[PDB]
Amino acid sequence: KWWEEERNVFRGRADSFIARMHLVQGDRRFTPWKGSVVDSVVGVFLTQNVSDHLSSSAFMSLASQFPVPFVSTMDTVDWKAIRAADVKEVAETIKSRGMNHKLAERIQGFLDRLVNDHGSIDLEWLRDVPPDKAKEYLLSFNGLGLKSVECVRLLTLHHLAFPVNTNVGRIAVRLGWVEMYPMLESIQKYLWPRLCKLDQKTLYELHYQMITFGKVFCTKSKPNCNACPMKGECRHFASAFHRVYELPDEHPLLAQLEKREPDDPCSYLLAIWGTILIPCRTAMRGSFPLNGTYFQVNEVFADHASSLNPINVPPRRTVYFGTSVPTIFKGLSTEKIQACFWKGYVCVRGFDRKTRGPKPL
DNA sequence: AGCTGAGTGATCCGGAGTCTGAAACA
DNA sequence: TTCAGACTCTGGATCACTCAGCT
Numbered sequence: 001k002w003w004e005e006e007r008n009v010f011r012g013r014a015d016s017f018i019a020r021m022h023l024v025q026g027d028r029r030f031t032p033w034k035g036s037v038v039d040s041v042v043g044v045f046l047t048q049n050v051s052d053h054l055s056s057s058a059f060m061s062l063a064s065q066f067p068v069p070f071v072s073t074m075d076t077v078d079w080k081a082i083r084a085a086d087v088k089e090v091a092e093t094i095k096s097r098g099m100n101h102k103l104a105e106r107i108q109g110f111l112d113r114l115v116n117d118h119g120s121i122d123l124e125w126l127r128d129v130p131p132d133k134a135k136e137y138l139l140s141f142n143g144l145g146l147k148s149v150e151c152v153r154l155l156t157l158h159h160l161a162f163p164v165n166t167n168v169g170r171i172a173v174r175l176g177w178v179e180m181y182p183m184l185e186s187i188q189k190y191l192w193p194r195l196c197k198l199d200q201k202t203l204y205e206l207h208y209q210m211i212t213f214g215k216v217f218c219t220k221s222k223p224n225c226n227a228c229p230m231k232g233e234c235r236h237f238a239s240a241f242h243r244v245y246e247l248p249d250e251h252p253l254l255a256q257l258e259k260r261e262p263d264d265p266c267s268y269l270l271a272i273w274g275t276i277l278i279p280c281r282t283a284m285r286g287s288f289p290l291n292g293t294y295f296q297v298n299e300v301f302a303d304h305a306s307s308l309n310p311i312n313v314p315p316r317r318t319v320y321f322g323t324s325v326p327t328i329f330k331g332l333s334t335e336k337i338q339a340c341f342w343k344g345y346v347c348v349r350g351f352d353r354k355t356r357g358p359k360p361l
Numbered sequence: 362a363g364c365t366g367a368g369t370g371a372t373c374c375g376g377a378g379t380c381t382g383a384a385a386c387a
Numbered sequence: 388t389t390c391a392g393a394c395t396c397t398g399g400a401t402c403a404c405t406c407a408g409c410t
């Protein structure tokens with residue numbers, strides 16, 4: 001059949017795209033997180049039409065404002081209190097993200113429906129049910145579309161789905177697979193049958209890589225096509241033609257700091273001027289929605305208390321600071337970005353340990 | 362035939378950055 | 388040197404309305 005042999009052609013190219021970038025884009029496979037299903041639902045709720053860092057910071061502020069009493073799937077937010085809470089404070093809590101009243105009312109309605117139907121607030125059983133019925137039940141909610149449900153299923157329930165976002169569509173069109181021409185998002189009906197038969201781990205990995213490639217090299221305006229490894233196979237090419245010292249685990253400075261997560265590859269950093277940068281997984285104790293796909297491989301947080309009041313006592317790694325990932329990554333040299341990926345760190349925001357809430361940098 | 366209707370295109374609930382061009386001045 | 392909007396940002400829900408559909 002012509003279909004199956006045509007499946008091999010792009011699947012061979014897809015793994016070729018993964019293999020070529022994996023040399024430069026670092027190494028990353030499925031690393032589990034302890035986030036509950038409701039947490040992932042609220043995360044996909046908050047990441048609609050907004051940049052990733054703002055969406056994550058909004059969820060962090062939401063968690064800090066209404067905390068579960070603490071020091072596996074466990075909710076980090078007293079969702080019952082939020083549902084019982086008045087709309088004004090909830091809207092004020094996430095006002096920094098935007099659409100504060102709209103999203104707050106949608107969240108309150110979601111929680112109210114969850115309480116009214118199927119008893120109390122729990123969605124752990126969604127993992128057991130067959131994927132199609134879970135997808136339909138998730139889509140049944142208002143404020144959720146196809147792409148959000150696909151991302152939830154792929155990242156949380158480990159199904160075989162692929163979110164075709166603006167990053168995915170542009171990359172697929174330009175990179176010899178399928179101008180400023182506005183293309184309607186229907187290439188999924190084209191792309192997915194090609195990718196219907198593929199390894200699950202393959203899909204998750206391909207895309208962590210693509211999200212990264214979309215953000216680093218193949219930006220919408222002025223892509224760094226000179227340093228891009230896939231410039232040879234790029235169809236769009238034919239159309240056109242501060243350093244820090246890292247602190248060991250048992251360093252005396254981290255006595256007040258909490259115990260590091262055993263799974264996190266990152267290590268504690270020293271922000272010299274005295275300030276400390278906490279790794280994202282350690283800062284959040286894992287337990288973050290969407291498998292922690294918000295944060296890069298080497299994304300770290302900052303300590304607001306140590307930033308305002310320095311803890312100063314009077315190997316070397318490079319940290320690139322900026323407002324967002326795409327801004328700093330615009331590099332005319334490939335070697336610099338490869339080094340920053342394999343042996344570098346990135347920080348964009350700040351965080352406080354006392355109230356566990358995000359603070360401006 | 363004279364009423365569907367399917368399907369798309371604007372719009373906006375909203376903050377927060379960057380980017381142009383205009384202006385201005387030489 | 389200002390600076391005011393014009394865009395983008397892992398999208399959804401409403402309302403209005405041009406091309407097919409038909410019988």
Ligand code: SF4
Nearest residue numbers: 218223225228231234
């Ligand atoms: S060569 Fe340029 S357009 Fe092609 S994939 Fe690389 S960055 Fe994108």
